[PDB]
């Protein structure tokens, strides 16, 4: 039953790959958002520093 378990592992690895790729793209978008928030926060920091 080695082939059967190998096929099951292939299916599991494919699902994990799909989920991880989706999470990577979502993380790219979230990086964009976080950088935007940092830029938004910058001016108040500058003014309060002065």
């Amino acid at each position: 039953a080695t082939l059967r378990e190998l096929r099951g592992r292939i299916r599991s690895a494919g699902s994990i790959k799909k989920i991880t790729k989706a999470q990577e793209l979502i993380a790219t978008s979230r990086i964009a958002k976080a950088q935007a928030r940092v830029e938004a926060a910058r001016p108040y920091a500058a003014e309060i520093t002065n």
Partner: protein, 118 residues
């Protein structure tokens, strides 16, 4: 639906769909954990675990192996209970409350014994 009726067929198909989705998600849960699933998928996983536990039953011929007397569930009660389960009406009960029991009365009694109210 023609033979068993629309209600029975629909409930059975919903149970099969939930269990199939849970089977699909089992590997992801094993590797990345449940916390990385969408909220709807978390709900479905909880429902599926409860459903799969509730499909188990204490059988008359199984007493010799467990010491627990068996039980019988009428078809109408089974359909109603699994309709309720597929809708998440028992999501608040622990999954262990659904393991090796009969109908909804057994579920309520076991849940009470486990510290929860059906």
């Amino acid at each position: 639906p023609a033979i068993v009726g629309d209600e029975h067929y629909r409930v059975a198909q919903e149970v099969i769909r939930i269990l199939q989705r849970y089977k699909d998600l089992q590997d992801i849960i094993a590797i990345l954990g449940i916390d990385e699933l969408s909220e709807e998928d978390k709900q479905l996983v909880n429902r599926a675990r409860r459903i799969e536990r509730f499909l188990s039953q204490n059988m008359m011929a199984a007493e010799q192996f467990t010491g627990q007397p068996g039980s019988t569930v009428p078809l109408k009660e089974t359909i109603e209970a699994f309709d309720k389960l597929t809708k998440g009406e028992f999501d608040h009960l622990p999954e262990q409350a659904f393991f090796l029991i009969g109908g909804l009365d057994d579920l309520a009694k076991k849940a009470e014994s486990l510290g929860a109210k059906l």
